[PDB]
Design a protein around this nucleic acid. Structure first.
Lengths: 90, 17, 114, 285, 614
DNA sequence: TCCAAGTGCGGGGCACTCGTCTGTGAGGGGGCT
DNA sequence: AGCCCCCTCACAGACGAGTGCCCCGCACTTGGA
């Protein structure tokens, strides 16, 4: 959303951007597509992701948060590892 | 070959003996 | 381990080739950003192009199309009330590894037509 | 018949022979009774109109049994009418419920109690106008599954088995017969599923102020080769044709209802060419 | 046009004494109908028994799962991995229902996808199904069918005794997603008060179950996977235990066997459609007259021989294999006797019927011996199972085929230990088949008395190759002359009246089972000379466009040559050039061609057409 | 003294209907290597 | 020398008020019991 300036996203785009990091993370190496899809469903049911209102893996979505809330979540999270904190700032 | 023509042919062949 | 008939497997990989290819790329291959939409005549043309057996258009083949729709292996992305008229659209909802598994148990390589 | 894909990618004695064909098709009727006795149904898929063949089968053979003839080519029939007819006119059990699958459960439950009461039903054009949805075919396949209800049916469209899955094709215990006659489709096409003279006829019924308003619209259309409402309003108030706005709006509403003026937001285009409109304009001189 | 067709009504009732066999006494007393009904009842009971023995193990596992849940919050569910043929398998659930009413273990409700469009309708269908199952085992309106009334009824009735509440979902894929998730959340909300057990009917795989169930729905699910056996396994079981059984007199040919297995293995995995196709084959075979009532057991065959009328001799004389019985006799008096006098053939008939029955019994036994001899070979050219060898040995003479020579080449290269193990297994399997199934059959002692001394001669050949290179060709030629040449004959080397038992009519069955509407429409739109048999409409090639054709054929041959968008005025001018009233004929032909779905009118454009074929 | 089932009638669920609104597939128009 | 890429416009879908119709409950009730 920062790169494409609040464009609608998908599960495949976000999963590709996540797997570009997970292959070099050395702590989240071998997570499948199923657990990431269930985590995307868990984000979808808590209304941190809202549908634009097709399959579940190709339905477009919207981020329902400001960036300051994510920036404060990065500060108040307990036991956040170093690789995730390095990936969050860049 | 039809049934009636073959039947008449065998009957004429066997009645001649 | 999902068991399918022969022509249902060929219809399924033809629907995958119709959803994973552009409409303008079909003229170069068969003459001899999710899945795209297609109509049933495009699926039948791709099936008779890649079949190389040339069977007839009976009731059982279109029944195989309808029971692939009712097995949630295809879908109806639009239309769906004028299916006989031809303005209904389909959508293939399977991945790549099941297509390659079907192509291995049949003998039809899908890596060429992509 | 094997169709090719390439065509998609690059884009008297006749009456005597017809009566001989009809007699050779009429020789099939005891065989059809023996097939219908053993649980199957009958499907016909020929070229010509098979209305007279099913009527002859109903007249010469099933002249005593219960028969529900269903004209599927009728453009305004419903599944509710057929199910209410089976519920109330054959079984005499009141009207069927509004949800049709509960009506089919009711028909199954009341037909399970009465063996050897065989109901026939003869659906001309099983792929008709209001039978092309999947719900009507599901209801017909649930009705044809009962061991008492027997089914004869006709097929005319070329895309008919696109809406029969394997459940609807194993429920329909069909036996595909080729009754290809050469009779023309005279009953199936006469229904509702299949200018200048009307303009002159409506124009001869209007009053003189409507004649002046329509001639003003015709003159603007032939001059500028669609007119807004304000130019017509000024051209009608200059010649004392209208009293206020609602009179002209009622005249244009009557014009829209009689199909002589096409209004698009509010431009008024007459949907004809210039030559017929020019000959129509010189017809009133 | 007719007084029957109206413009208001769509349905017409002809009720004759309706309240709240089609054939009379003429057909039922005829012998062919009784033998057809008896044979079909035998075969249907046999296939039903095989389906019960196939299903009973996982049925017992489901009953053990339900009772173990009864002997005990999330709800226990059981995904039953059935095949893609759901209306083939629904009777499975029916049998389970009776088992759940055998031990008084649970109460069964079947939720069909057609009656569950909304959540409200699904809850009403569930509560109504449970309450009417209670009323059936030992009427409320559907407005008062809620979970409150269900909890009050379950507290009123079954608390004093726990009775489980089984909710069967036969078609899991055809359900709506949202109604299914709300139904699972409703059934999981009420656990602890009402004991719910859920079973499913998932056809494809478990990945569909894990994909259609979200995180919050699958948080309250404790599923256990049950797997039923596949449909080709059921096909092979039915084809090896019923259709190749020696105790039935009706035998299919090779062509019809290959046709029915082609329909199964290539189009649909339905045992139901295969059974109805075999039933149509049996019906069209047995409905060929009263002389075809002789295709039964031997004593009833003798009775029907003593029962036959005059025309039955003249319809068993019309068979094409009866003439090799006549021409091969050098006599003349016997030819006069069996051609006309109607009783000498009536005395000569039972020896021919006994020869046919002996030929089919020895064919089955020699086929079992040959498939045990050929099945252990690598690369299996003649076929692994019994059915492909059945087709290949009935369709032609098997020794003239190149695949038998390839089998002989790959078999003669083998060392003596595996060879003697293969032939010892073959003799053990053949004698096991001879004593376990052939011996209780009528006229089965003669077949064993024919085969068994030959089998002992093969056994002495096996001992001779135990005590010994050049004996191997002697043993192979002894197999070829004692098993394959005399008892594995083709359909053209058959006994002379084998058309009473073998059904060889494949064209009418192929055109009356497989339905081709488009082929008939295309044939009748290219050349009507195939149908009308007229003498001015004949075509040397199917595009010559003769002007005296029927009126639809000319319009079809005019728009068939053009592209997608068809202009109407040059179409009308071409029809006027090929052949007031002509415009009305063109309008009628365009209406008939639009009604069949070949073209359609354009909406954006006036006076044009869009064709719908290619 | 009451009463069983037709029945007359109000009320709510539902289905069409008219208007608005927005994507969009393919026919149509302008350039191309 | 047929082909490559935007335009756009009435179907497709939605949708939303909104309004009439038909099933359904339900008291009436009445000639009978």
């Amino acid at each position: 959303s920062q790169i494409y300036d609040r464009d609608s996203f998908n599960f495949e785009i976000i999963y590709a951007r996540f797997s570009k990091f997970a292959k070099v993370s050395t702590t989240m190496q071998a997570v499948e597509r199923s657990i990431v899809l269930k985590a995307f469903e868990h984000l979808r049911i808590a209304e941190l992701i809202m549908p634009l209102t097709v399959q579940k893996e190709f339905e477009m979505h919207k981020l329902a948060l400001t960036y300051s809330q994510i920036h404060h979540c990065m500060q108040r999270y307990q036991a956040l590892p170093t690789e995730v904190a390095q990936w969050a700032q860049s | 070959e039809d049934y009636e023509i073959w039947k008449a042919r065998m009957l004429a062949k066997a009645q001649a003996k | 381990s999902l068991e399918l008939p022969y022509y249902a497997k060929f219809l399924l990989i033809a629907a995958f080739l119709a959803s994973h290819n552009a409409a303008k790329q079909d003229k170069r291959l068969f003459v001899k950003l999710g899945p795209k939409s297609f109509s049933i005549d495009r699926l039948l043309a791709i099936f008779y192009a890649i079949l190389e057996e040339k069977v007839g258009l009976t009731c059982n083949l279109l029944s195989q199309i309808s029971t692939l729709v009712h097995l949630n292996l295809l879908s109806f992305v639009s239309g769906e009330q004028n299916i006989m008229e031809g303005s209904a659209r389909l959508q293939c909802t399977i991945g790549l590894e099941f297509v390659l598994q079907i192509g291995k148990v049949v003998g039809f390589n899908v890596r060429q037509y992509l | 018949f094997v169709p090719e894909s390439d065509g998609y990618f690059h884009s008297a004695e006749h009456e005597g022979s017809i009566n001989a064909i009809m007699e050779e098709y009429r020789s099939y009727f005891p065989k059809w009774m023996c097939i219908l006795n053993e649980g199957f149904n009958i499907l016909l898929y020929g070229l010509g109109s098979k209305h007279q063949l099913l009527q002859s089968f109903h007249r010469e053979v099933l002249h005593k049994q219960t028969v529900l003839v269903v004209n599927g080519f009728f453009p305004s029939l419903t599944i509710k009418d057929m199910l209410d007819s089976i519920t109330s006119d054959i079984l005499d059990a009141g009207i069927s419920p509004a949800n049709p699958h509960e009506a089919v459960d009711m028909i199954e439950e009341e037909f399970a109690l009465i063996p050897e009461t065989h109901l026939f039903l003869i659906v001309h054009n099983l792929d008709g106008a209001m039978l092309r949805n999947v719900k009507a075919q599901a209801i017909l396949s649930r009705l044809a599954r009962i061991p008492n209800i027997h089914l004869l049916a006709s097929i005319d469209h070329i895309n008919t088995p696109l809406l029969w899955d394997q459940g609807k094709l194993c429920s329909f215990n069909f036996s595909w017969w080729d009754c290809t006659t050469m009779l023309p489709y005279t009953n199936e096409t006469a229904f509702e599923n299949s200018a200048l003279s009307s303009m002159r006829s409506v124009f001869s019924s209007l009053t003189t102020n409507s004649r002046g308003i329509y001639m003003l619209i015709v003159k603007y259309q032939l001059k500028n080769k669609g007119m807004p409402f304000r130019d017509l309003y000024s051209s009608c108030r200059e010649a004392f044709l209208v009293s206020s706005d609602l009179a002209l709006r009622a005249q244009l509403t009557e014009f829209l209802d009689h199909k002589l003026v096409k209004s698009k937001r509010e431009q008024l285009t007459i949907p004809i060419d210039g030559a017929l409109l020019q000959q129509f304009l010189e017809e009133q001189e | 046009m007719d007084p029957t067709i109206s413009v208001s009504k769509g349905c017409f009732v002809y009720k004759n004494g309706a309240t709240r066999s089609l054939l009379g006494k003429e057909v039922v007393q005829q012998p062919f109908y009784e033998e057809y009904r008896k044979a079909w009842n035998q075969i249907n009971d046999h296939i039903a028994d095989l389906q019960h023995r196939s299903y009973a193990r996982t049925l017992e596992q489901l009953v053990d799962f339900v009772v173990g849940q009864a002997e005990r919050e999330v709800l226990p569910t059981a995904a039953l991995l059935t095949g893609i043929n759901q209306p083939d398998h629904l009777s499975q659930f029916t049998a389970l229902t009776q088992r759940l009413h055998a031990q008084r273990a649970a109460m069964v409700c079947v939720l069909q996808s057609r009656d569950c469009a909304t959540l409200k309708a699904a809850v009403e269908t569930l509560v109504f199904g449970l309450v009417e199952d209670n009323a059936e085992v030992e009427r409320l309106r559907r407005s008062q069918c809620t979970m409150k009334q269900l909890k009050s009824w379950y507290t009123n009735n079954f608390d004093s005794e726990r009775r489980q509440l089984v909710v069967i979902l036969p078609d899991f894929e055809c359900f709506n997603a949202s109604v299914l998730q709300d139904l699972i959340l409703i059934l999981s909300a009420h656990c602890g008060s009402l004991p719910f057990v859920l079973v499913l009917g998932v056809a494809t795989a478990m990945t569909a179950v894990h994909g259609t169930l979200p995180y919050h729905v699958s948080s309250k699910i404790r599923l256990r996977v049950f797997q039923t056996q596949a449909a080709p396994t059921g096909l092979n079981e039915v084809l090896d235990k019923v259709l190749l059984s020696p105790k039935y007199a009706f035998h299919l040919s090779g062509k019809t066997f290959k046709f029915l297995t082609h329909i199964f293995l290539y189009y649909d995995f339905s045992i139901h459609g295969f059974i109805q196709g075999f039933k149509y084959c049996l019906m069209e075979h047995f409905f060929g007259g009263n002389a075809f009532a002789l295709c039964t057991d031997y004593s009833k065959a003798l009775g029907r021989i003593k029962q036959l009328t005059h025309e039955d001799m003249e319809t068993i004389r019309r068979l094409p294999s009866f003439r090799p019985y006549v021409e091969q006799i050098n006599d003349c008096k016997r030819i006069i006797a069996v051609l006309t006098d109607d009783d000498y053939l009536k005395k000569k008939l039972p020896q021919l019927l006994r020869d046919c029955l002996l030929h089919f019994l020895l064919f089955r036994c020699s086929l079992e011996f040959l498939t045990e001899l050929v099945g252990d070979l690598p690369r299996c050219p003649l076929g692994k199972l019994r059915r492909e060898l059945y087709v290949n040995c009935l369709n032609r003479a098997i020794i003239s085929t190149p695949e038998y020579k390839e089998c002989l080449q790959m078999l003669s290269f083998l060392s003596k230990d595996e060879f003697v193990a293969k032939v010892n297994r073959a003799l053990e399997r053949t004698e096991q088949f001879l004593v376990e199934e052939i011996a209780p059959l009528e006229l089965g002692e003669a077949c064993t008395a024919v085969l068994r001394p030959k089998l002992e001669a093969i056994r002495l050949a096996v001992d001779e190759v135990v005590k010994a290179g050049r004996a191997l060709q002697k043993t192979l030629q002894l197999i070829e002359t004692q098993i394959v040449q005399d008892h594995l004959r083709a359909l053209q080397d058959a006994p002379p009246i084998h058309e009473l038992f073998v059904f060889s009519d494949i064209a009418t069955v192929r055109r009356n089972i497989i339905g081709a509407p488009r082929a008939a429409l295309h044939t009748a739109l290219n050349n009507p000379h195939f149908y009308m048999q007229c003498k001015c409409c004949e075509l040397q090639d199917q595009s010559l466009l003769v002007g005296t054709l029927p009126d639809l054929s000319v319009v079809y041959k005019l728009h068939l040559e053009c592209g997608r968008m068809i202009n109407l005025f040059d179409w009308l001018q071409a029809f006027r050039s090929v052949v007031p009233q002509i415009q009305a004929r063109f309008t009628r032909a365009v209406a008939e061609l639009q009604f069949l779905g070949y073209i359609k009118m354009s909406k954006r454009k006036t006076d044009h057409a869009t064709r719908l074929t290619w």
